[PDB]
């Protein structure tokens, strides 16, 4: 089997991407944030504290003839950005782009933190990291990909995120028309439950490539590119007037600037992030100070190849017995 679904930016900055997901019988379609950095499929629901719902579409398990309460199971998750959610668990039928999993754990939110409430466009998350990170207790549950894998034509999914445009998540096949050149595969460590890999280096604009190992995670659920302070300083030094602002919480730059590209290495291959991808717009409405899309990972504890990086590539998440990651230009 295979599936193919369009993923759509939530706003004009590509702050996140939403993908429609069918849950239950009859189908209830919710727009979920597919997150290769976490491993819970959780939704706003009829059980979510009413004051914490503001415009989201909810899953109502009582209206699904295939929903079953997973007795005794609870979940609770906290994300790198400080947001969180928790609740109880149903199993139900879940379909993505024509690919159907029966008995998928659907984690129903009883509580969500303010940032989730405040984002009316995201109805929940669909985790695509390794199931070892799943938070369901006392019986850990499998991700949608993990459940689908054996049925797929090939045990893979691909992320093809657009810049200011829709893109695609495919399950079970590699669309050879969706990228240019070849796909370069690179080793993955699953030791921390992430799609963790080692970039071979970077360049800033038309500058020379610096060969250096940068361990980080391929994370579709993180907006920006978070890299070591040395790398980030080298990037922003090429932008007149750019500075790290403690009050804003990262590097800012004059909105009048033309940003240089940023290249990262995948083996001997190179992925080029155009400068415009690194512009996240005014820090506050009407400001001429703009927020940068490349930020320091210092104090995160891990480097993160988030959407800024991934959207410059066609990315293969290869879930074979020994997982690997593939990157192609597009």
Swiss-Prot record:
Catalytic residues identified in the record: 35, 199
Enzyme superclass (EC): hydrolase
Descriptive protein name: Endothiapepsin
Full-protein residues shown: 90 to 419 of 419
Domain named Peptidase A1: residues: 17-328
Gene Ontology terms for molecular function: aspartic-type endopeptidase activity
Disulphide connectivity of cysteines: 255-290
Keyword Protein biosynthesis recorded: no
Similarity-based family: Belongs to the peptidase A1 family.
EC numbers, comma separated: 3.4.23.22
Keyword vocabulary terms for this entry: Aspartyl protease, Disulfide bond, Hydrolase, Protease, Signal, Zymogen
Source taxon at top rank: Eukaryota
Catalytic activity: Hydrolysis of proteins with specificity similar to that of pepsin A, prefers hydrophobic residues at P1 and P1', but does not cleave 14-Ala-|-Leu-15 in the B chain of insulin or Z-Glu-Tyr. Clots milk
Source organism of this protein record: Cryphonectria parasitica (Chestnut blight fungus)
Biological process annotations from GO: proteolysis
């Amino acid at each position: 089997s295979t599936g193919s679904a369009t993923t759509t930016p939530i706003d004009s900055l590509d702050d996140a991407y939403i993908t429609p997901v069918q849950i239950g019988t009859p189908a209830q379609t919710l727009n979920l944030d597919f997150d290769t950095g976490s491993s819970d499929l959780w939704v706003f629901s009829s059980e979510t504290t009413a004051s914490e719902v503001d415009g989201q579409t909810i899953y109502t398990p009582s209206k699904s003839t295939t929903a079953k309460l997973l007795s005794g199971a609870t979940w609770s998750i906290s994300y790198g950005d400080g947001s969180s959610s928790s609740g109880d668990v149903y199993t139900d039928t879940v379909s993505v782009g024509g690919l159907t999993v029966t008995g998928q754990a659907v984690e129903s939110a009883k509580k969500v933190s303010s940032s989730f409430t405040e984002d009316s466009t995201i109805d929940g998350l669909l985790g695509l990291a390794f199931s070892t990170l799943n938070t369901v207790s006392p019986t850990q549950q499998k991700t949608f990909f993990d459940n689908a894998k054996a049925s797929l034509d090939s045990p893979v999914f691909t992320a093809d995120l657009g810049y200011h445009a829709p893109g695609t998540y495919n399950f079970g096949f590699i669309d050879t028309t969706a990228y240019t050149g070849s796909i370069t595969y690179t080793a993955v460590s699953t030791k921390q439950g992430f799609w963790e890999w080692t970039s071979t280096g970077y360049a800033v604009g038309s500058g020379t490539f610096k060969s250096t190992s940068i361990d980080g995670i391929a994370d579709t659920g993180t907006t920006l590119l978070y890299l070591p302070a040395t790398v980030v300083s080298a990037y922003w030094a090429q932008v007149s007037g750019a500075k790290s602002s403690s009050s804003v919480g990262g590097y800012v730059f004059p909105c009048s600037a033309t940003l240089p590209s940023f290249t990262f290495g995948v083996g001997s291959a190179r992925i080029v992030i155009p400068g415009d991808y690194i512009d996240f717009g005014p820090i506050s409405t009407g400001s001429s100070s703009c927020f940068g899309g490349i930020q320091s990972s210092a104090g995160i504890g891990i480097n993160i190849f988030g959407d800024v990086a991934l959207k410059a590539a066609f990315v293969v998440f290869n879930g074979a017995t020994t997982p690997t990651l593939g990157f192609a230009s597009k």
